[PDB]
Design an enzyme around this catalytic site. Structure first.
Site, short mmCIF file in Angstrom:
data_model
loop_
_atom_site.label_atom_id
_atom_site.label_comp_id
_atom_site.label_asym_id
_atom_site.label_seq_id
_atom_site.Cartn_x
_atom_site.Cartn_y
_atom_site.Cartn_z
N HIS A 1 71.60 29.75 19.61
CA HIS A 1 72.22 29.74 21.11
C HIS A 1 72.43 31.22 21.67
O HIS A 1 72.68 31.36 23.06
CB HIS A 1 73.66 28.94 20.93
CG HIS A 1 74.39 28.38 22.25
ND1 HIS A 1 75.72 28.60 22.20
CD2 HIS A 1 73.85 27.98 23.34
CE1 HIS A 1 76.10 27.94 23.32
NE2 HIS A 1 74.76 27.48 24.22
N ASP B 215 71.50 25.80 14.60
CA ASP B 215 71.79 27.27 15.59
C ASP B 215 71.42 28.19 14.66
O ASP B 215 72.35 28.84 14.05
CB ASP B 215 73.14 27.05 15.69
CG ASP B 215 73.43 27.93 16.96
OD1 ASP B 215 72.35 28.46 17.32
OD2 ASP B 215 74.73 28.13 17.19
N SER C 213 79.50 34.87 18.10
CA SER C 213 78.29 34.05 17.65
C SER C 213 77.25 34.85 17.06
O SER C 213 76.97 35.85 17.79
CB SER C 213 77.63 33.20 18.88
OG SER C 213 78.82 32.17 19.22
N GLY C 214 76.46 33.97 16.12
CA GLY C 214 75.16 34.70 15.54
C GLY C 214 75.64 35.65 14.35
O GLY C 214 74.86 35.92 13.66
N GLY D 86 81.07 35.63 21.64
CA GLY D 86 80.66 36.77 21.50
C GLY D 86 80.60 37.21 19.96
O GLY D 86 79.98 38.29 19.61
C1 LIG Z 1 80.06 31.98 19.80
O1 LIG Z 1 80.10 33.17 20.35
C2 LIG Z 1 80.79 30.85 19.95
C3 LIG Z 1 82.27 31.30 19.70
C4 LIG Z 1 82.14 31.39 18.13
C5 LIG Z 1 80.68 30.33 21.42
C6 LIG Z 1 79.25 30.29 21.82
N1 LIG Z 1 78.37 31.37 21.61
S1 LIG Z 1 78.58 32.45 23.16
O2 LIG Z 1 80.13 32.66 23.50
O3 LIG Z 1 77.60 33.60 22.76
C7 LIG Z 1 77.61 31.70 24.19
C8 LIG Z 1 77.84 30.62 25.08
C9 LIG Z 1 77.28 30.17 26.46
C10 LIG Z 1 76.64 30.94 26.99
C11 LIG Z 1 75.87 30.42 28.11
C12 LIG Z 1 76.21 32.23 26.59
C13 LIG Z 1 77.15 32.67 25.47
C14 LIG Z 1 81.45 29.19 21.60
O4 LIG Z 1 81.93 29.05 22.93
O5 LIG Z 1 81.51 28.13 20.84
#
Ligand SMILES: *C(=O)[C@@H](CC)[C@@H](CNS(=O)(=O)c1ccc(C)cc1)C(=O)O
Ligand SMILES: [Ca+2]
Length: 240
Positions: free
Chosen positions: A45, A93, A188-189, A186
């Site tokens: 994602h 993911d 995530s990953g 932010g």
């Molecule tokens: C990860 O950060 C996660 C929370 C732990 C987020 C989704 N990831 S993100 O914030 O990188 C993502 C969301 C949507 C877009 C278009 C870009 C970035 C979550 O909300 O679960």
């Protein structure tokens, strides 16, 4: 990371910052784990948008020169073939990034240790989430790398109706849910590091939090279970 503390700069040398080109600058968007000198593991994602990405290793403060960073472009993005943008709850993911240059290793830059395939953590196992994500629900990214203790919540408990129900799968790890501490946008990953047999290993790739908020009681942060994808990871690294 909500409810976190600033990590010492040499505690988590495998954490990277995945950033995208924004005008004349670069913006952090996700974490990732260095797993080869030229490969990073992150969430699928994070690379759903058709942006220009770079990885920063040996990063500690996003807004200041630390004197330890190496900046490298992303040359190839391999997302799990089963990933679907529209169904994060389906899993898969995970994505591997081949770096344009091999990075150099040192005390701030190391390869993340991955668990043996199939490994499942006992409920309440000790883990730390790290990252520069929001420090509060609807907040701002952290300047300095944060860490928070998030004990695992096993599958039977995490998939019960009071927690995540059917949204959680056995290919994922849940951790936290105390209502105070959690991953946040932010993060995530990035890695979920769990202490097993005296060694910290990256058991999770941060994937999602509730739409209600980051730190929500009984909505532990959810991670892709790294030990479910070891053969996939080795297959991609071997074939490219
Ligand atoms: C990860 O950060 C996660 C929370 C732990 C987020 C989704 N990831 S993100 O914030 O990188 C993502 C969301 C949507 C877009 C278009 C870009 C970035 C979550 O909300 O679960
Ligand atoms: Ca820096």
């Amino acid at each position: 990371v909500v409810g976190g503390t600033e990590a010492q700069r040499n505690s988590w040398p495998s954490q990277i910052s995945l950033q995208y080109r924004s005008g004349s600058s670069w913006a952090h968007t996700c974490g990732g784990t260095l797993i080869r000198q030229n490969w990073v593991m992150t969430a699928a994602h994070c690379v759903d948008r058709e942006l220009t990405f770079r990885v920063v290793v040996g990063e500690h403060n996003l807004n200041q020169n630390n004197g330890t960073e190496q900046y490298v472009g992303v040359q190839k993005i391999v997302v799990h073939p089963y990933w679907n943008t529209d169904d994060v709850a389906a899993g898969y993911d995970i994505a591997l990034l081949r770096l344009a240059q091999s990075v150099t290793l040192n005390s701030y830059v190391q390869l993340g240790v991955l668990p043996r395939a199939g490994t499942i953590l006992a409920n309440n196992s000790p883990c730390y989430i790290t990252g520069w994500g929001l420090t509060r629900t609807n907040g701002q990214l952290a300047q300095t790398l944060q860490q928070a203790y998030l004990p695992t919540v096993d599958y039977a408990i995490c998939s019960s109706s009071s927690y995540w129900g059917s949204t959680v799968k056995n290919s994922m790890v849940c951790a936290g849910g105390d209502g105070v501490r959690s991953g946040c946008q932010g993060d995530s990953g990035g890695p979920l590091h769990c202490l097993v047999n005296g060694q910290y290993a990256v058991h999770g790739v941060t994937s999602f939090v509730s739409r209600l908020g980051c730190n929500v009681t009984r909505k532990p942060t959810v991670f892709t279970r790294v030990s479910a994808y070891i053969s996939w990871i080795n297959n991609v690294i071997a074939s490219n």
